[PDB]
Amino acid sequence: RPRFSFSIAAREGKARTGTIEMKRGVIRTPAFMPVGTAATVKALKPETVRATGADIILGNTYHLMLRPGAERIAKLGGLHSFMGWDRPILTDSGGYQMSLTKQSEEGVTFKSRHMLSPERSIEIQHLLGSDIVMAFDECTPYPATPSRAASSMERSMRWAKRSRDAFDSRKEQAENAALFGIQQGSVFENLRQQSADALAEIGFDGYAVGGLAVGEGQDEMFRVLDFSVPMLPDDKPHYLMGVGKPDDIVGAVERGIDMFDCVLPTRSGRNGQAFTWDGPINIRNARFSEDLKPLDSECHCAVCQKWSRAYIHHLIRAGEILGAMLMTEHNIAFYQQLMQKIRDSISEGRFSQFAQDFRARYF
Amino acid sequence: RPRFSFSIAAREGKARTGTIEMKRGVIRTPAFMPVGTAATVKALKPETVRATGADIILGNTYHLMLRPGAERIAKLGGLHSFMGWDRPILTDSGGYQMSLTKQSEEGVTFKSRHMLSPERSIEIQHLLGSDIVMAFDECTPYPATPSRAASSMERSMRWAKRSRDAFDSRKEQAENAALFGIQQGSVFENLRQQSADALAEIGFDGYAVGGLAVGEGQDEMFRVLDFSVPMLPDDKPHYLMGVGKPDDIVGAVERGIDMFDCVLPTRSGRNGQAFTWDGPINIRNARFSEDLKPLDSECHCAVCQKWSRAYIHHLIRAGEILGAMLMTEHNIAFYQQLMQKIRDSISEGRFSQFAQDFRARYF
Numbered sequence A, B: 001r002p003r004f005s006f007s008i009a010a011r012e013g014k015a016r017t018g019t020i021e022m023k024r025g026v027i028r029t030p031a032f033m034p035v036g037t038a039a040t041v042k043a044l045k046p047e048t049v050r051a052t053g054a055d056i057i058l059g060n061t062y063h064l065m066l067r068p069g070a071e072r073i074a075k076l077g078g079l080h081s082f083m084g085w086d087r088p089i090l091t092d093s094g095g096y097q098m099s100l101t102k103q104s105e106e107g108v109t110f111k112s113r114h115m116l117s118p119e120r121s122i123e124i125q126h127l128l129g130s131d132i133v134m135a136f137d138e139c140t141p142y143p144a145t146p147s148r149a150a151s152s153m154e155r156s157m158r159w160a161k162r163s164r165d166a167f168d169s170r171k172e173q174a175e176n177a178a179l180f181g182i183q184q185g186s187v188f189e190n191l192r193q194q195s196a197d198a199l200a201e202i203g204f205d206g207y208a209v210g211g212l213a214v215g216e217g218q219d220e221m222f223r224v225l226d227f228s229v230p231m232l233p234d235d236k237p238h239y240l241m242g243v244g245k246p247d248d249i250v251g252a253v254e255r256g257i258d259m260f261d262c263v264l265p266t267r268s269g270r271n272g273q274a275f276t277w278d279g280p281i282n283i284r285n286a287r288f289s290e291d292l293k294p295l296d297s298e299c300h301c302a303v304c305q306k307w308s309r310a311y312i313h314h315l316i317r318a319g320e321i322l323g324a325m326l327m328t329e330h331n332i333a334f335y336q337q338l339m340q341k342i343r344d345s346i347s348e349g350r351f352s353q354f355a356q357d358f359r360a361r362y363f
């Protein structure tokens, strides 16, 4: 394979399906990336993550720089060999993870003390051996005034240029990894346009829509996507950071998004929430204590082939680790089945019907 | 297969190796039973427990009667289908699990309020669909005076008779399951003899040595085994309840024990302790933070094939579920490799050399 090649095999409206080819493997798009923040997708072996259909997972510069350390992981052979995942890994840059500081034009120092900057973020992502490196940005808080959103976006665009130059100055990274830029501008069309233009002038391998999934709510998120995604280069992947619930994913693909991540299937699975095609259920509810059906009636995952709602109910109520394992495997497999149904429906020219059907039943 | 058949294929001294055949499968002896107290071997799918080599797992009447309930499990199709383990299951009777009350000759009531008795224990084990049912006994506290140990043992022997009659009165249970008696008598030879005699007069499919692994320490435990195991019928399995550390298992097999259980590999694995042929290690120790070796240098388990000490160190320090999963799978696989080396060495007439070699290196 090449360092990076995105090809679009079929289209319907603004939706696209295709493939990203990288040295460590092929990513089918639209893609959902399970989140592996501490060098693990919580409660799953990497072979189980792959068996659900994932082609790529997400890691985080911020978390891994703190524990176990980026230089440590490099000394141990990089993130892929450390955790036993040999396929592509995308790493976020630390520009969100303000969520968990002294800010300046140079970067951010935060509470031991640590520092991140465009140069240091890109370096950490190199030490980890990331395949898709995210530019170092500022996720603008929501809501933001137009002035604050503009200042923040402008700084992020200067940081995007510094990110590009830091990545390109490291020959091994430039030859083997890809770099994505992150659009900012909050909910304001003109600032989203200025940001898209800045990013396309610099030039990246892919373009993320940043600054969403920060409390704005679906209607607003969709309105911003309606004008923001068309601003990005059409021939590169479009990544919506941190999204989301199954309905959010379907509507975002209808608006031109190719890549997704979120902790909802893993985190809410450990808390008892199971996704089904008839909507989410909370397995802790006493109504499931003698329910012999699988979590979902159609799901092909190994959990639904083997165990009942009643058993998983018991495990979660008892605080047993196997309950977290089973709930997480099912929810990640559900998300991957959703992405496969989206890909196949776009490929067959029937995605808009799929999206309507999905919603009618899920709600 | 038959309901129950124990065959001894080879002997060395007091040690034996062979097989127990039951309707749900064959158990290779000497056997280690992973503990699955809440209807799960903690942090392992049943297929992973089987892949480590286990032939049988242990469940507990006390815990399962409280959560999810014995009648509930029966309504759901029994413990095997509930948890997805289709091989034999031994259940303890609740006579230990005083550890976690109003006692009388009729049984014990304990804190909601619950009751156990010989009749109710055997009934619960039937509702669960246990393959090896334990008689309802009193595990005598340690230390005990000879008078208190005698009173307690005598009550247990009356309860053993009631257990036998309750099991035999239930045709489906009598035809499909096995019943083991439990010897008591604390550390006193004459009371152990009286108990063995009582149990052999009643007649059981197997005989447990109860009342040990309750704080007495290895030397004392071994002294009691030295005289107690020969008192039991030679042609039936001998089960030492709750034992134990790898060295305890080796010395108990040298004294005629065929079956073992304990929470040490699962519980101490979640707490960071890994078994190796050079003795246990605590993976949380900072000396492992950049150690690329597997947990154990010779272990054939999937954990040792794929992940380093450094990674597992990270996971346990971070409180990640995958650390508990990996540590537990390795420790259970280590225990099963120990039992396989014991079986093969007895079969080859070189168990005493194995035991000496094991100890020289483990210590």
Ligand SMILES: Nc1nc2cc3nc(N)[nH]c3cc2c(=O)[nH]1
Pocket: A092, A093, A094, A095, A096, A097, A134, A137, A138, A139, A140, A182, A209, A210, A211, A212, A213, A214, A241, A242, A243
């Ligand atoms: N670097 C970066 N990461 C992000 C991660 C996110 N997760 C959610 N929910 N929203 C996010 C936005 C950003 C963002 O704007 N920048």
Ligand SMILES: Nc1nc2cc3nc(N)[nH]c3cc2c(=O)[nH]1
Pocket: B092, B093, B094, B095, B096, B097, B134, B137, B138, B139, B140, B182, B209, B210, B211, B212, B213, B214, B241, B242, B243
């Ligand atoms: N029913 C029964 N169960 C037991 C379980 C045990 N676990 C350890 N550590 N010792 C034990 C003794 C008994 C015992 O004497 N009776």
Ligand SMILES: [Zn+2]
Pocket: A295, A296, A299, A300, A301, A302, A303, A304, A305, A330, A331, A333, A334
């Ligand atoms: Zn499923």
Ligand SMILES: [Zn+2]
Pocket: B295, B296, B299, B300, B301, B302, B303, B304, B305, B330, B331, B333, B334
């Ligand atoms: Zn191992």
